[PDB]
């Protein structure tokens, strides 16, 4: 699009970035991050799927480790979500720890099967374990 950048709000930064012409996607690599709020969505690599509106209909993330962080309080700066792969509803602000998952905050962490990330006074309570790879 034309220059408008006095009105930006989201920022991604990448060391290797690629469009995906024959399939509409955009794919990013090299310790990449997308920022807007306390949701510290870094990875190595990000696959942004998008439609006719340039609307980013869903995003997939991966790295070594696979995880993102979040800032919840000035002391509770340390919350995070990890899993076998990560997929993100940019359509509603909710991240999903795909297949098998781990979720951590100060004083608590929970792990097991696939789960959607929480930002309220409620947990997932489902329990198990999963290997690294």
């Amino acid at each position: 699009g034309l220059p408008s950048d006095r009105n930006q709000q989201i920022s991604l930064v990448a060391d290797r970035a690629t469009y995906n012409e024959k399939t509409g996607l955009t794919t990013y690599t090299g310790n990449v991050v997308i920022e807007q709020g306390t949701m510290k969505l870094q990875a190595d690599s990000i696959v942004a799927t998008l439609n006719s509106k340039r609307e980013i209909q869903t995003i997939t993330a991966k790295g070594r480790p696979s995880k993102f962080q979040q800032q919840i309080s000035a002391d509770k700066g340390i919350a995070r979500g990890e899993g076998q792969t990560i997929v993100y509803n940019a359509d509603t602000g909710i991240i999903t720890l795909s297949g098998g998952a781990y979720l951590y905050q100060d004083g608590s962490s929970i792990r097991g099967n696939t789960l959607k990330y929480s930002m309220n006074k409620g947990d997932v309570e489902a329990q198990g374990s999963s290997s690294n790879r």
């Binding site: 699009g1 950048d5 930006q8 991604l12 930064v13 990448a14 060391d15 090299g30």
Partner: peptide, 16 residues
């Protein structure tokens, strides 16, 4: 609200 696509390797930026 809009997206900034800023580059390492180059110190430049992009949009959609």
């Amino acid at each position: 609200v809009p997206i900034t696509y800023v580059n390492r390797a180059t110190x430049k930026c992009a949009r959609y």
